[PDB]
Symmetry: D2
Subunit: 418 residues, 4 copies
Amino acid sequence: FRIAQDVVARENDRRASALKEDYEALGANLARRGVDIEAVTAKVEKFFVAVPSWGVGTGGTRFARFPGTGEPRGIFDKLDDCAVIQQLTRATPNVSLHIPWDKADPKELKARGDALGLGFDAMNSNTFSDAPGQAHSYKYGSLSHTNAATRAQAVEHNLECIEIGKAIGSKALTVWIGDGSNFPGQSNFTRAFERYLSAMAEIYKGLPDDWKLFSEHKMYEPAFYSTVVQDWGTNYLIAQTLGPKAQCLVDLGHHAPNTNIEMIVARLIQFGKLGGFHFNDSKYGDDDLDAGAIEPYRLFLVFNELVDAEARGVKGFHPAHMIDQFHNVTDPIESLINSANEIRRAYAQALLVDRAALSGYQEDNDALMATETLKRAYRTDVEPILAEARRRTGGAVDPVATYRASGYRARVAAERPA
Amino acid sequence: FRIAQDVVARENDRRASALKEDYEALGANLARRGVDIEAVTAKVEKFFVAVPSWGVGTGGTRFARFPGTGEPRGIFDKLDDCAVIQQLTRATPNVSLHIPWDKADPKELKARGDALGLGFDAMNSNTFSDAPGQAHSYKYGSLSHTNAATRAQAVEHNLECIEIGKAIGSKALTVWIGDGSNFPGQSNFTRAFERYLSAMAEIYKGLPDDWKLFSEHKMYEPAFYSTVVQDWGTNYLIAQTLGPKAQCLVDLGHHAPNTNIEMIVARLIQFGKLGGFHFNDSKYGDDDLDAGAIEPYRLFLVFNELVDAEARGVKGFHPAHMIDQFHNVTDPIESLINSANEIRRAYAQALLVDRAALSGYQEDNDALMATETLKRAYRTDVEPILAEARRRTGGAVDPVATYRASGYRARVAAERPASV
Amino acid sequence: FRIAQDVVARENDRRASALKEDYEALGANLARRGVDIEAVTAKVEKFFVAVPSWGVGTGGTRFARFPGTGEPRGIFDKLDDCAVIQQLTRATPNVSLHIPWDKADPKELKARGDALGLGFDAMNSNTFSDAPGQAHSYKYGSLSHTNAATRAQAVEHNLECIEIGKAIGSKALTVWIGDGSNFPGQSNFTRAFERYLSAMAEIYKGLPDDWKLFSEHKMYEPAFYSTVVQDWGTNYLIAQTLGPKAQCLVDLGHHAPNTNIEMIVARLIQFGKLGGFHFNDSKYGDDDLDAGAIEPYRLFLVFNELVDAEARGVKGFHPAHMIDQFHNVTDPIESLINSANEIRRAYAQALLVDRAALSGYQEDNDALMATETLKRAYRTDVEPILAEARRRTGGAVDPVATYRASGYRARVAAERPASVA
Amino acid sequence: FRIAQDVVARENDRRASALKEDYEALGANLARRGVDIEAVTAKVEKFFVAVPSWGVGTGGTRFARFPGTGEPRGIFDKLDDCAVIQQLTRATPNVSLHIPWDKADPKELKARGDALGLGFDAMNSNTFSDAPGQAHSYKYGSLSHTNAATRAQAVEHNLECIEIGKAIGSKALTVWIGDGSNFPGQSNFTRAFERYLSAMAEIYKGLPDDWKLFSEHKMYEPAFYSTVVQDWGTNYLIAQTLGPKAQCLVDLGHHAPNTNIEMIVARLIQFGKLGGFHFNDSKYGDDDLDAGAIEPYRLFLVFNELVDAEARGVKGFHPAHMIDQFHNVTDPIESLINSANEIRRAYAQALLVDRAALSGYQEDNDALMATETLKRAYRTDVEPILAEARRRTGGAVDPVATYRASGYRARVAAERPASVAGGGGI
Ligand SMILES: C[C@H](O)[C@H](O)[C@@H](O)[C@@H](O)C=O
Ligand SMILES: C[C@H](O)[C@H](O)[C@@H](O)[C@@H](O)C=O
Ligand SMILES: C[C@H](O)[C@H](O)[C@@H](O)[C@@H](O)C=O
Ligand SMILES: C[C@H](O)[C@H](O)[C@@H](O)[C@@H](O)C=O
Ligand SMILES: [Mn+2]
Ligand SMILES: [Mn+2]
Ligand SMILES: [Mn+2]
Ligand SMILES: [Mn+2]
Ligand SMILES: [Mn+2]
Ligand SMILES: [Mn+2]
Ligand SMILES: [Mn+2]
Ligand SMILES: [Mn+2]
């Protein structure tokens, strides 16, 4: 227990009375709306999203990095910090690892995870930066590099990530690369994509039959003119070409300005290629900000498509959920805590949508009532449900409040002198 | 001839000396670069782009329309004006018709086109607006409308367009609809797309053996929250689902801000689904401005992909080329003339690219020289090639100058009554 | 009464029990947070936003217009419909007129307004389209047209708008023009702006002592390459150049993609040039959609800046609030009703922000708690407050439901002839 | 001479014949258009743009940095490399320094510059990152930080930059900060701006009489929700508030998608606040790519506004031209060479515009001919003018070709330590 159980209990009891009042009030309101609050809480308690190992330490921009106190010094420290997020929110039982950033003895990583009550989600490969002793540089690409030996090196790296994942219980490999060009003419769009497809086919050949392979598209950065896997269209072509175990991963901040992202989600679901999500928020580019902190309605609309898929009777749909954020000006743990909370908030609200009423307004082309039907769910303050879900499962009514009351940051600051 | 031949001859003669000097100079410059100017001229003279019947009349915005003089009323007046563009540029032998705007007896349409030296490109259906006496409104959609009878009406309309096209020599149907939603929840994205795919399959069944069906994606407008055929990804799904006769049409101004459009073109070519283009330029949204007037390099980069596809003999590559613009503050004929010119300009420059050198710099990851290889072609003023191509084929050395010298606008202004 | 009182009464009674339960529960929650729900409701019931006359009829795009039934015949029918919105929401007592669309005898306009319990907000001029009989066309511009005679014609039109406004009770003139270019080189940016400044200076000379002149910026449309009054920077230069009576109007959908609009609002307030707002929502361009239907948080963030101005004690701050929307696929009256509701919703939430706590988190650079302080207010479902405000002021607990129960649309559909040409 | 004179001569002689043919042909073409090619070349030879010291080293993104061979060890190596750009293009006689990156003995800097034939443009302060031994962190801001002591430290740093600039010959200070917020509510927009204005007022008081203070706006990055100096409107307020010595700097890649940047330039000129430029190109965000490599017409349109002003001679009007780019996948020197060339290319084409004809088409509302009047100039290949300008001023006909023939990169690679690849960071 990273956070003392007496502190969690103390801070829960301090807020118990108010929560009971709010939960009962919301329960009565939902009952008048024909909704059983217990049914919603039950589902919310089971919604999990993976926390990124790279999100526990302070992040930075190309201009600078401003570390806070008690910065995790490596993957083991990061797991310790991830354990706090899970203990308090109970929404992040699994951690996403990144190789080679998190290279360490796989057996030990698993042992630490087991002891902390943490599992492992999809592995993440890294061929967008060079490691010491690397024979070929990824400056001009990796899986799509013009040099055969460089592509082979990239493929081998991904296979190594799979081996590490098999040792810790991971069941998927997420591949995001920076491959692209900064100048017109630098790359031949088609040949580069053909090279990428051939290299990914080699990774697919080495992909276990109990694993999934996720490709992540991105409009730009680090490539500023063209990117090989630039959007969901190219991503679909990739997944379809590689095989049934290959699917598309949608990172919210990787789309062109004003893109209707929830529609992309719906399209990928319809064609069975929505592998998972990388949650975060943004306003300008791939800002990697706390989920829902900028555009909470958009997050709700994405979850509205996920819940509709269930309502439509879609089968075999269990998308992977992961947070992909960098925290440059906040306590990383607090941001991950509230981000995970925001994701459950949007999910809970999506569950409140009166699907029967919405379907009726859609068929009758009553646009105003259709949108108001979504708003009635979205406007509902589901915090009491999120808090009760946490309380009932060993977490904290007010996660960040308990975190601060525990003095954890000051504790690790003292344990991790810099 | 819409424009008197003696006027064309006269306006060519007064500009012939300068063209001779510039063509010979460009010829020597290209010769020093290992390029045969005549070879480029040969390709340029065979590049054609269809002119839109809806482009010769003055366009407008939702705020207002400011018509000019001699506004063409009806397809017959429009064809007469399109004929001027072809006569002077020799780059627009075919016209794109839009139904019901251009509805007229098929035999009469074909007869008029033949007399004017004009052919007909892809037909364009219209289920994004309501025509008088229409049984079902398209306010909430057409091919993807929730009402079965409304979808059937839209399908029937498209089949009618195919019948008209068959009668006049067309070999394709372009389908662009406004279908979408203005509010979250208004439409179920998936169900709407399912309805669209089912309706399009019916249209597909009515396609002759040698016809193509082009679906045109658009991010937004008239729908301001979601659009069924919103981007090339959805467009690809449509084409692949419908069959080999179905391909994607790319309209330059229909993409999100900063989109790499030339890459979309490359992707569609690789998978054999680049049905064609709707050329125009833009800066903010689907502005429908004169091609190349805002971002000429982007137009060149699109053509770089087109010329590259040819260079490597890509299978199934044969996109249709069409101009889709609205002229709100210029003489429509002049804008179409210069737009067709800009399109041939970008094509000619793409032809100048040293493909062998480019491939070398790409393989060696010499980004600077690779981009400079494209720039050497793009920086070349190919106007002499475009002008000489026109001069040798019955066109005008300076199309707009000849147009103005002819007094054509004043002529039709006298034959056509304005509102006031 | 456009809507029968017995219908409003019956529909309010039908929902009285639920409103009581929700309002009281919210009241208890707010109290635990140190907020007096009564204080919030009292301010909410006093928040007004002007309804656009051009928003009562169905709108359209450059591709098509799909009118509904009972479209207004003219301004008088539009005022009658605005009376419905005000009766039910009690948040829209004033109407924004547009000349020449709403041109009519000022005495008659005032008479109808008074009879319906409606007032008039800022006048709106129209030199972005040609009216019959004009000696000069606005095709290539109006107030910034290269032709002096054309500029003079546009100036006189704006002065006429002021005269009409003075007669009906208006106290401001909003000037939005399409002036700009579609091609590089078509216009000399500086000279076009100078011409505009000269024309606006003339209009300024016609302003009564207690009037304001609002200039509205827009990035593009109808001009697709450059627009004279393209953004808030140019707008500020206009207001500062003209004088103390000249201020800037911010229309939410008139900014470049990803623009931080709430900051623009803050900047104009700081330099005393925030004249007012044109509320609406959008996702792509100037979509003119129902306020808050696309990005409700942004709307709240704009109001957060407005309320912060009061918190900072900004003297003499009385921004005009107006809705500027077009309803292409809904009953215009219903959209305006829910849009006014959404505006009061964002306002109410902004009032809930614990600014004492917020100021502390800002000082200590506690970004997470600072943003959570805003979210605690925004996440609060203030619908009970909006509904109670309506109940106590003669409005409807559920405006659209009551509107539908009244059968108003069918009624006017039988009284108003549809366009046949 | 960084590049052997015999190499420059040899590589010019090799291309002299073709240049003569192209220059004479262009000369005849321009003569038919009523333009004297010599008058254009004369102006082009005098057009200068400052090179960024931070541009000669390989750049990086927040994801990774892939240095090449012969990376500069410090400011002295950087000046040596900048000397190559000036020798071959003759368009970059001045270098822009950044403190503390280029901190060194002022006398030594001045000495190296004088020896290389290089001068110094505007100084650039750095309060967007923390330096070793720094008392107060700029994590939450600098000039607009809530903490008074932090703002004071930032002000003092800027004054130090002025002192260094005075010693080496600089006549301006460019201030770009990352100050902003990543979350709604984190910052009070107004109070933050008030703090910024007050701090800048202190910096302004320390400005010499013949110096300029340039504030640089940026929509976002590093701040991802709000930025204090976010656009030209705020920038104008800053310049107008501070005084006549304060002007606005326009960096091309710092605007919202689809922004009409050339209009911003015109507006700033109209109100006398166009301090200068930071040239580069971009497609998505502040990409910092080689000028003109992505949107060459936009660069020409910006220069069209500059030449228009340079034509009707707004006097004393001398905006500071500077390149601000990062080169992540090319030889930094080659990119700066071609970028400077591209800037002169746009300038040259703008000089070809028939101003009288354009004015006429504008007054007559002949939109088509007005735009064609601009295109007639833009379509002209002015490379012969650029190459001849270089040839007769001591530069190279084909700069990059000569650079490669000289083997300079391989030369400095052998004179400098090898570099290691790593994570993000410019
Ligand atoms: C760290 C992680 O691999 C990374 O964030 C990618 O998922 C992608 O979002 C990059 O922009
Ligand atoms: C008139 C023509 O159908 C239309 O322009 C479509 O092709 C599409 O561009 C609409 O935005
Ligand atoms: C009708 C009204 O004048 C108009 O909407 C303007 O306010 C502006 O928004 C235009 O885009
Ligand atoms: C290094 C230099 O200070 C920096 O590039 C600034 O000028 C600004 O462009 C940052 O985005
Ligand atoms: Mn990601
Ligand atoms: Mn990312
Ligand atoms: Mn089109
Ligand atoms: Mn279009
Ligand atoms: Mn408006
Ligand atoms: Mn508007
Ligand atoms: Mn800069
Ligand atoms: Mn920058």
